């Protein structure tokens, strides 16, 4: 997260870190057994880390639970990033309390102008590299479909939305991928892609979670 703020420990209780020996992507806990992330974050051997603030220090609220199964969206296209969503099942159920909690799925799609909370452990610089150890947060609005398409001609599908600031300086970034965009207490987006980070006229692009609620529910119900 570039141009954000330190969230505070366990203030984003649905945020998870996906770990394969190291943090590599975010995700969102949607029930005791299941995490939403980006399909482009897929790999084998994932350990889901819940209750994290500093990802390099054991602070006392963590739950580390290996994944049993990952399910990339049936129509994920890694070239275009269309349908950039996957589900990860935990080998055992997480213990839920105020520091580790699921986030609700949306019942309707959010609108341009709505304020959301984007979070993650990704790079905090737009030029060069600095990774935080504690969770960063950014409040940002959803942008109009027209301004999103004008920013990224030929690239924005109906399964994507832009959020952030066209002036630059505030955005998600590498290492945030797969993490949440939460608006009015609902998971509306997944950190997906963008041109660089925090660049002028290059806002963040997010997977539009409301399009996937029926797939998510039916997949969980049978897996
Ligand atoms: Ca920790």
Distance CA 154, CA 132 (A): 33
Is residue 53 part of the annotated active site? The answer reads no
d(CA 202, CA 44): 31
In this structure, which long-range contacts are made by residues 11-15, counting pairs with CB atoms below 8 Å and at least 24 apart in sequence?
Answer: 11/135, 11/137, 12/117, 12/119, 12/135, 12/137, 12/180, 13/51, 13/98, 13/99, 13/100, 13/101, 14/101, 14/102, 14/103, 14/180, 14/182, 14/187, 15/52, 15/119, 15/120, 15/135, 15/179, 15/180
Is there a catalytic annotation at residue 84?
A: yes
CATH tag for 13-102+211-222 (out of 2.40.10.10, 3.30.70.1450, 2.40.270.10, 3.40.50.12160): 2.40.10.10
59 is in an annotated binding site: no
Q: How far is the CA of 60 from the centre of ligand 1 (A)?
A: 7
Q: Is 39:84 a contact under the CB 8 Å cutoff? A: yes
Domain with CATH 2.40.10.10 in the chain: 1-12+103-210, 13-102+211-222
Element (DSSP H or E) covering residue 149: helix 145-151
CATH 3.90.245.10 matches 1-12+103-210: no
CA distance 63 to 10: 12
Count CA within 13 A, CB hemisphere, residue 167. Answer: 5
């Amino acid at each position: 997260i570039v141009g954000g703020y330190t969230c505070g420990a366990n203030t984003v209780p649905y945020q998870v870190s996906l770990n394969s020996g190291y943090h590599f992507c975010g995700g969102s806990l949607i029930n005791s057994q299941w995490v939403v992330s980006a399909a482009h974050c897929y790999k084998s051997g994932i350990q889901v880390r819940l209750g994290e603030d500093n990802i390099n220090v054991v602070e006392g609220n963590e739950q580390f639970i290996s994944a049993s199964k990952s399910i990339v969206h049936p129509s994920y296209n890694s070239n275009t990033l269309n349908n950039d969503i996957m589900l990860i099942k935990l080998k055992s159920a997480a213990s839920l309390n105020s520091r580790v909690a699921s986030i609700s799925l949306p019942t309707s799609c959010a609108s341009a102008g709505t304020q959301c909370l984007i979070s993650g452990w990704g790079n905090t610089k737009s030029s060069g590299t600095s990774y935080p150890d504690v969770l960063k947060c950014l409040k940002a609005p959803i942008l109009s479909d027209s301004s999103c398409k004008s920013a990224y001609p030929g690239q924005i599908t109906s399964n994507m939305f832009c959020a952030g600031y066209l002036e630059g300086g505030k955005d998600s970034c590498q290492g945030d991928s797969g993490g949440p965009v939460v608006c009015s207490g609902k998971l509306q987006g997944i950190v997906s892609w963008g041109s660089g980070c925090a660049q002028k006229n290059k806002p963040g692009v997010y997977t539009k979670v409301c399009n996937y609620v029926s797939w998510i529910k039916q997949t969980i119900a049978s897996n």
